[PDB]
Design an enzyme around this catalytic site. Structure first.
Site, short mmCIF file in Angstrom:
data_model
loop_
_atom_site.label_atom_id
_atom_site.label_comp_id
_atom_site.label_asym_id
_atom_site.label_seq_id
_atom_site.Cartn_x
_atom_site.Cartn_y
_atom_site.Cartn_z
N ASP A 194 0.83 -1.20 0.00
CA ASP A 194 0.00 0.00 0.00
C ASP A 194 0.87 1.25 0.00
OD1 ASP A 194 0.87 -1.04 2.36
OD2 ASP A 194 -0.88 -0.48 3.54
N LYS A 201 -1.38 13.65 12.93
CA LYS A 201 -1.69 12.52 12.07
C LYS A 201 -2.96 12.73 11.26
CE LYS A 201 -1.94 7.39 12.37
NZ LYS A 201 -2.93 7.54 11.24
N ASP A 214 -5.70 1.14 -3.83
CA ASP A 214 -4.29 1.49 -3.98
C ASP A 214 -3.39 0.38 -3.46
OD1 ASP A 214 -4.32 3.88 -1.16
OD2 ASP A 214 -5.21 1.89 -1.49
#
Lengths: 840, 805
Positions: free
Chosen positions: B481, B565, B734
Site C-alpha cells: 500500500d 496525524k 491502492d
DNA sequence: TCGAATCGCCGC
RNA sequence: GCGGCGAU
DNA sequence: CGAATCGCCGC
RNA sequence: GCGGCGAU
C-alpha cells in the site's frame, strides 16, 4: 381495416392542457395563445386526414402491405412462412409417389419471395371475392411473374442496364410491358439460353396459391379457412378471412401513425424558445414533438442532451424570432396568373434518340404534375396567412447542424414561396438601404457576375421597365422573364415605393446575400489557398470570379494545345475499333465551343465528392447527348470517348484551380476509411479494433456524429416492392461533404448571433449560405458575415481539431497509412473583410 | 400484502433459455447450473430481506419511510397542499405550522395508524399530538443559532420518544434560560387537537381518495414487489465472470431485472454517457481483474469458525465522563453491527469453502475506482481478507519468500522500518510463527497483531515453506500500500521533490512518516513561539491567550506524529484549518481531560485553534504541490458551478456547469452534484435540480485524485498482465497484491505505470482544456493560473522501495 | 469485384 | 426503397 | 453559512 | 436524509 379517430379525445388535449396554454399566455396573452393552440391542433388534424386518404387509396389498390402500419406484422410472420416452405419441400421430397402439382412451381421462386408474395397478395385481396380459388389464382400469377422475369434479373450484368428503365416506369402493367420487351430482345440475342417461357396454365396457378394459403395457416395463421355449404356439389365453397387480432394490429398501428404525422404550419406568435433537445418551436405538448436535431436514431438525439452549446441555442432562437409577413402585392399577382398557366413564368411568348425523346416527354409530364401540386399548396398557405400582421417559422437542425425551418411553407423554398414572403419589421430604407435594394434587384434579374457599380447601372437603366412592372405586373411581363421572377417583382414593388415615398420609405424586404461556392470557400479558408480563394471570391478581385469560366478557360487551354500536339488516333481490339486520340478529341470539342456551361455541374458536384469518373456521366448527359438530339454533336462521333476526354480535362483543371478542396476532402476521406475499417490480425482472425464512427465538433460548439449503418439483409422483387453494422463506404462517401456542411452551418449560426449582438439586426432570412435582412441592416449583415468567417479560421484549425478527436481511436497498423495534415497556404484571412463578392 | 415476484420474476433471472451451454461448453454444466442457481438465489435472498424490513416498518407505522410508499405520497402532497391554502383563502375571505408540514404530518400519521384503532377519533388524536409536538419543538428551529448547536444531538437521538426527551430537556434549558420566549408551550386542548386532526383528515378525503382506498394499497404493494426484485444479495461466482463488452450485462452471466452496470451512477443518464466512449484499456483491466481465481483459505476458516462462537469479536478482548458514557452505548451498537457482517462473511466463506475456485465480478464507481460486486469480496475486513486466498499458485522462490516475510511484518505492523529490519523481525519471532501455525488456538500471538487473520494466513504459509522448502507452492496474496496515495499522485504531477520524500516517492535511506515531518515543524514553530509571541490581551470580558502562552501549554503537552496525524489524511479529503481545529480537540485535547491531563489547556478551543494554524502552515510547506493543486481544481469548480449574470439585468451569461475530465486510461468522469430546490424537514418526524456549488467545490479535488489512482490501478493490472505473466491480482483501490512469486514483477509494474503516465500526460492542463471554453468572459480574469512544476525527477520513483506504488 | 452531400414535399 | 419536384 | 468515495446494517 | 460499522 377500420381505424378509430384519434381526433375526438387526443387531439382535443392539445388545446385543453393548462401548462402549455399558460406558458404561451404569459408571453403573448390568452387570445394569441388560443389561436396558436387551435392552429397547432389543425396541423395535427390535417396530418391525420393525410394518412386516412393514403390508407384508403392503398387499400383500394391492394397496396396495404406497402403501408407502414402493416410492415411490423409482416416482419413477424415472414420467418414462420419461410420455415414452413422449406420444411414442406423437405417433407414432400421424403414422401414417395407423385410429387404434388405445386412442388415444381414453388421451387424456382426463392422461398423468401413466395412468402412475401402470398402475404401481400392475400392482404391485397382481402382488404380490397374472399374465395380461396381467386386468391390462390392471384398468388400464382404473381409467383409466375416473379419466376419468368426474375430469370432476367439473376443475366445480372445485362439487367443492371435495364434496371433503371424498369424503375423509371410506374405501375405493374407498364413494368410488365417493358419486361416482355426486354425478354424478347435478350432471347433474340440468345442470352436467356434461348428458352422461351411456357406460360403456366390456369389450373396450375390455382394449385400454386392453395399450397401457399395452406402453408400460412399452419405456420403463421393470419388467414383462416372456412367452408360454406359442405357436401352440396353446387354450392360447396371455401372462404378466407383475416385474423381479427392481426387486422386490429394494423388498425391500432394505422391510428397510432396518423396522430404522429402532422402538417406543420407557421406560427401566429413567436416560436417557443429552445431550452433543450425537444419541445421547441411549437408550443403545445404534442404527439410528435420537435427535435433540435433531426436524427435517424433516438440515440443520436440523446447525445445532444448533455452537451453545452449556448451559441447554437442562441442562433436558432434568434432565427425563430424573425417576424415574417405575406407579401400581398406579390400574392395578388400570383393568384391571377396561376389560374391561367400551370407554371406562371414557364412559357411567356417572346420575340434511339426518338426513344430518348419519348422518355423526356414522360418525365416532363411527371414534372408538370409534381411542380403544380407544390405550387397549389404554397399559394393556399400564403392566402391563409395573408391577413396576419406577422407570422413566425420555428427552426431546427439536421444531424450535421444546418438550419432548416419546420413548417411546410417556409422561407427556404422556391422562388414563388420566397417571393410570397417578406419580413414584417422594416426600417426606413436610407441611402445605403436603397443601394443594396438595387443590388438585390440586380441579382434577382441575373446580373450577378458583374461588379456592384454596373449592377446599379443595370437597375437605373431599366428604371422605366421596373416602374411599369410595379404599376401593372399583369400588363408587363418583363419581371416574369427574369431569372428569379417573383423575387424580382418583389424588388420592383419596393423600388417603386422608394421613388414614390423617398428614402424615408419603410422597407421590410429580405435582401439575400449568397456565398458563391460555400464548400470551396470554407476549404480554401481552412488551408489558406490563395488561388482557390480568389476563384470563389474569398479574396478581393478586380471582377466577380466565375469558377466555371475559370475551369472552362483552363479546359480550353488544354484543348488548343492538344489540337497542335497530342496522340493520333489508333485502332484497338475490343471484346477492332478506332480509339480517338487527344488531337482528334480536342478538335471535336473546339468545334463545339467549351463554355462555363460545359464545366458548371462538375465544379458543383466537387463538394459532394464527385471526381473524374462522375464527370464523364455529367458531360455526356449535360452537353453531348443534348447536342446529338439537337443535330449538333456530329463532331462527337464517339460520344463516350469525348466525355471521358473532357472529364479528364475538367478534373485536371479543377484540381489545379482549387487545390485546398481536393487535398482536404482526401484527408477527411482517408480518416473515415481508417476509422470505419475493422482491424483484424490475419492469422488469428480476431478483430483488434472494432469499426468506429466519425465525430467532430463545430467551432460554434455543435457536436456531430457520422454513423452510417447498413442493414444485414434485404429483399427485392421485380413487380412488387422489396421489404446494424457501420457502412464504411457511406462513411467515406459522406465525411467530406458532411464536414464542410457542418462548417457552413456554424458560420451561419455564428453570423446571426454576431449580427444580432454587435449590430441591431433582428430579422434574418437564412438559406444555409444565403443571409438576408431588411435593407437598413443589409450593410451590417454584409459586415457581420465576413467578420465571423475571418474569426473562426483565425481562432480555430478545424482539421487539426478533427485529427485530435480520432487520433486516439486509430489502431497501430493504421497510423502509417494516415496522411499528414495538408499544408497551409499563403492566403491572408483579413482580405475577406474587404472582399466585395464573397457575400459570405 | 405483497405478491411474490419470486415465482415468475425470479424464473426470468434464471434465464434457463439463453443456452446454459454457452456456459456449459466452456466450464461444465454443473458449475453453469450452480452459477445460474446462485444468481437466482441471490435475487431471492434480497427479496426476503426487503420483506422482513417491510414488515418491521409495517408494525412500527414506518411504511411512509419505505420507498414503496413514497411515490404516492409525493403525488398526493401538492393536491393536499393546494387544498390547505384553498380553505386558508376561504377562511380569510369570510370573517368568523407550515402548510406543507400539515399535509405531510397528516399523511404519515394516518398511514401509520392504518398500517398498525381504525376509529376516526383515535387517528386524529394521534395526528393532533404530532402537530402540537412540531409547533413547540419547531419554535427552537425557527433561536436558530442555538438550534444549530442542538441539531447534531437531536440527529444522534433515535426513536420518536428519544428525540422528544432531548427536545424536552433543551426547551427547559432554553426556558430556564428564557431563550424560547419565557413563554412555556401552551398545551392544545385535547378536544382541539382532535379538532385539528378531523379537520386535516376531512381535507385529505376531499383532496385525495386515499381514505385506506384499495388502489393506494396495491400501489405500495406493486412498488414494494418491484423493489424486492431489484435488490439482490450478490454472491461470488463459481464460474469465471462474464467479460465486460459493454455498459451493462457484464460480470454475472444471467439476464436480470437488475443487470450489472460498468459504472455505478446515481442517474441512468450518467451511465448512458459511457456507451459512446471508446475506452478499450479500461475494459481490459476490469476483465483481467474478474479473471483472478480465488479459493477460501480453509486453515484460516477453521480457526475463525471456532473463535467466532466464543467471542462476539474473535480478537477484540484477549487476556494479556458523561460523554464517555454516551460512547459505551455506541460501542454496544458497534458490537452488534460487526457481528451481523461477521456472521454473513463466515456463512459465505463456509458455503464456498469446498469449491476449487470462486470468482468475483467487478465494476467501478463514477470516479473509476474498481469495486468487487459481491457482498463477500476480497475488499473487506482483515478476517474477510484472511478467509480468501488466490487459487492460482507458483513455487515461492527466494524472492517470493522475502516478500512473504515483508507482508507478514506489515501485517504485524512493522511498516515504518526498512525492509532488512522487516525481514529481521520475522526470524526473531520464527519460533512464535511456527507455534501459531501448528496450534492457532493454543497461541494467541497471531491475534495480537494489527491484521491478525491476515497475519495468521501468513503464519500458515511461512510454516508451509519451512516444511517443503522453496519448492512449496504459495498462492497467498501479498498486498503493498502506498503511504498516502493522494499526496503521492499530487506530488508526481507537479514534481514536488519535498512531497516525494514525505510520501517516500523518492529513494530514501529510511521510511518517512509525514505525520512526523509536520509535527517536527510544528515543534519548531512552538519553540520559536515561546521565544516570540503575541502577549495575552483581554477583550463578560475574556483574556485571549497569547501565541507564546498557547505555545507554552502545547510545548508542555508536546506534539507527536499522532497529533498531526489526522490533519494530513483529512487533507486529501479536503479538510482545512477550520476543520482541523475540531479534530485536534477531539483527538488530543478531549482524551487528555478525561486522562486528567489537559490541565495546561486553560481553554481547549484556544489551543485547538492555535494548534490548527500550526499544522496547516506546517502542512503547506511540507506538501506544497498537494495544497497548490487542490486550490486550482477547487477554484475551477467554483467558477464552473457559479452563475454569471449581468449585474443590473440578472440575465444568466453562463449556466451552472458540471466539470468533466478524462483519466489517462481513457475513463471519462463527469462530476454533477445536484441539489433539490425545496426540502422538508420535521423535528420529530422524518424528513422528506440545480448544480450544488459547494458540493462541486468540496468534491472536485478528492474525486480527481481518486480517478487518477483508479486509472493507475487499471493501468497496473493491464501492464502487469501483458508485460509479465501475472494473471492473479488482489486490488484494494491502492493496494496491489499477487502470489509471492509474481510480487516483485508487480512491485516493478506499479512504478512503471505511475512514471509513464505523468511523463506522458500533464493531467491538470488536460483538465483545463475541458472547461476552458465553458468559462465566461468575466471568469477568465478570476481563474487562477496552473501551479508551477517542481524539481522532482520521476525517474527517482522507480528507485524508491518505500513508495510501494 | 465493386463504386463512382444533406434536407424536405408529392407519388408508388 | 423506387419515381418525380424543390432547397443548398 | 461552510467548512472524498464506495459498501453493509439501522431508522 | 439521519445514525452506526467497515474498505480506501
Amino acid at each position: 381495416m377500420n381505424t378509430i379517430n384519434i381526433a375526438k379525445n387526443d387531439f382535443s388535449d392539445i388545446e385543453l392542457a393548462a401548462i402549455p396554454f399558460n406558458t404561451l399566455a404569459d408571453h403573448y396573452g390568452e387570445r394569441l395563445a388560443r389561436e396558436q393552440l387551435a392552429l397547432e391542433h389543425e396541423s395535427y388534424e390535417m396530418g391525420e386526414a393525410r394518412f386516412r386518404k393514403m390508407f384508403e387509396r392503398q387499400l383500394k389498390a391492394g397496396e396495404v402491405a406497402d403501408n407502414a402500419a402493416a410492415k411490423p406484422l409482416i416482419t413477424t410472420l415472414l420467418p414462420k412462412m419461410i420455415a414452413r416452405i422449406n420444411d414442406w419441400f423437405e417433407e414432400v421430397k421424403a414422401k414417395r409417389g407423385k410429387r404434388p402439382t405445386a412442388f415444381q412451381f414453388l421451387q424456382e421462386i426463392k422461398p423468401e419471395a413466395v412468402a412475401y408474395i402470398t402475404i401481400k397478395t392475400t392482404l391485397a385481396c382481402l382488404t380490397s371475392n374472399t374465395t380461396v380459388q381467386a386468391v390462390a389464382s392471384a398468388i400464382g400469377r404473381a409467383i409466375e411473374d416473379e419466376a419468368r422475369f426474375g430469370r432476367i434479373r439473376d443475366a445480372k450484368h445485362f439487367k443492371k442496364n435495364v434496371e433503371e428503365q424498369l424503375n423509371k416506369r410506374v405501375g405493374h402493367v407498364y413494368k410488365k410491358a417493358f419486361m416482355q420487351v426486354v425478354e424478347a430482345d435478350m432471347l433474340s440475342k440468345g442470352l436467356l439460353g434461348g428458352e422461351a417461357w411456357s406460360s403456366w396454365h390456369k389450373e396450375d396457378s390455382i394449385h400454386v396459391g392453395v399450397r401457399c394459403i395452406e402453408m400460412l395457416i399452419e405456420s403463421t395463421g393470419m388467414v383462416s379457412l372456412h367452408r360454406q355449404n359442405a357436401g352440396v356439389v353446387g354450392q360447396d365453397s371455401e372462404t378466407i378471412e383475416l385474423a381479427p387480432e392481426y387486422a386490429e394490429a394494423i388498425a391500432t398501428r394505422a391510428g397510432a401513425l396518423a396522430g404522429i404525422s402532422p402538417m406543420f404550419q407557421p406560427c401566429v406568435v413567436p416560436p417557443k424558445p429552445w431550452t433543450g433537445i425537444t419541445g421547441g418551436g411549437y408550443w403545445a405538448n404534442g404527439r410528435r414533438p420537435l427535435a433540435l436535431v433531426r436524427t435517424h436514431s433516438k440515440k443520436a438525439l440523446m447525445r445532444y442532451e448533455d452537451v453545452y452549446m449556448p451559441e447554437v441555442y442562441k442562433a436558432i432562437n434568434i432565427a425563430q424570432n424573425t417576424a415574417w409577413k405575406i407579401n400581398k402585392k406579390v400574392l395578388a399577382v400570383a393568384n391571377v396568373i396561376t389560374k391561367w398557366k400551370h407554371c406562371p413564368v414557364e412559357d411567356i411568348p417572346a420575340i434511339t434518340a426518338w426513344k430518348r425523346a419519348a422518355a423526356a416527354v414522360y418525365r416532363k409530364d411527371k414534372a408538370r404534375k409534381s411542380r403544380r401540386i407544390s405550387l397549389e399548396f404554397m399559394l393556399e398557405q400564403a392566402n391563409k396567412f395573408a391577413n396576419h400582421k406577422a407570422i413566425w417559422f420555428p427552426y431546427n437542425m439536421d444531424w450535421r447542424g444546418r438550419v432548416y425551418a419546420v413548417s411546410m411553407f417556409n422561407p427556404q423554398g422556391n422562388d414563388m414561396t420566397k417571393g410570397l414572403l417578406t419580413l414584417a419589421k422594416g426600417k426606413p430604407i436610407g441611402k445605403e438601404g436603397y443601394y443594396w435594394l438595387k443590388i438585390h434587384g440586380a441579382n434577382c434579374a441575373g446580373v450577378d457576375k458583374v461588379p456592384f457599380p454596373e449592377r446599379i447601372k443595370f437597375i437605373e437603366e431599366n428604371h422605366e421597365n421596373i416602374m411599369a412592372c410595379a404599376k401593372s405586373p399583369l400588363e408587363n411581363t418583363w419581371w416574369a422573364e427574369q431569372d428569379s421572377p417573383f423575387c424580382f417583382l418583389a424588388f420592383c414593388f419596393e423600388y417603386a415605393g422608394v421613388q414614390h415615398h423617398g428614402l424615408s420609405y419603410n422597407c421590410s424586404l429580405p435582401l439575400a446575400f449568397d456565398g458563391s461556392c460555400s464548400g470551396i470557400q470554407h476549404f480554401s479558408a481552412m488551408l489558406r489557398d490563395e488561388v482557390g480563394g480568389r476563384a470563389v471570391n474569398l479574396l478581393p478581385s478586380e471582377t466577380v470570379q466565375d469558377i466555371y469560366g475559370i475551369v472552362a478557360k483552363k479546359v480550353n487551354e488544354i484543348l488548343q494545345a492538344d489540337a497542335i500536339n497530342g496522340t493520333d488516333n489508333e485502332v484497338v481490339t475490343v471484346t477492332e475499333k478506332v480509339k480517338l486520340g487527344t488531337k482528334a478529341l480536342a478538335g471535336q470539342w473546339l468545334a463545339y465551343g467549351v463554355t462555363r456551361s460545359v464545366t458548371k455541374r462538375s465544379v458543383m458536384t466537387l463538394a459532394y465528392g464527385s471526381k473524374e469518373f462522375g464527370f464523364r456521366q455529367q458531360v455526356l448527359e449535360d452537353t453531348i447527348q443534348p447536342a446529338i438530339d439537337s443535330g449538333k454533336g456530329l463532331m462527337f462521333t464517339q460520344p463516350n470517348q469525348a466525355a471521358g476526354y473532357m472529364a479528364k480535362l475538367i478534373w485536371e483543371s479543377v484540381s489545379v484551380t482549387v487545390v485546398a478542396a481536393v487535398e482536404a476532402m482526401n484527408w477527411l476521406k482517408s480518416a473515415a476509411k481508417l476509422l470505419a475499417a475493422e482491424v483484424k490480425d490475419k492469422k488469428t482472425g480476431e478483430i483488434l479494433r472494432k469499426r468506429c464512427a466519425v465525430h467532430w465538433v463545430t467551432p460554434d460548439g455543435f457536436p456531430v456524429w457520422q454513423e452510417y449503418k447498413k442493414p444485414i439483409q434485404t429483399r427485392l422483387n421485380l413487380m412488387f416492392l422489396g421489404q446494424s453494422e457501420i457502412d464504411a463506404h457511406k462513411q467515406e462517401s459522406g465525411i467530406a461533404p458532411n464536414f464542410v456542411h457542418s462548417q457552413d452551418g456554424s458560420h451561419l449560426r455564428k453570423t446571426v448571433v454576431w449580427a444580432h449582438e454587435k449590430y441591431g439586426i433582428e430579422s434574418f432570412a437564412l438559406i444555409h449560405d444565403s443571409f438576408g435582412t431588411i435593407p437598413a441592416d443589409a450593410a451590417n449583415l454584409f459586415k457581420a458575415v465576413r467578420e465571423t468567417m475571418v474569426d473562426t479560421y483565425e481562432s480555430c484549425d478545424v482539421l487539426a481539431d478533427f485529427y485530435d478527436q480520432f487520433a486516439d481511436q486509430l489502431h497501430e497498423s493504421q497510423l502509417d497509412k494516415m496522411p499528414a495534415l495538408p499544408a497551409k497556404g499563403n492566403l491572408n484571412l483579413r482580405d475577406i473583410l474587404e472582399s466585395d463578392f464573397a457575400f459570405a
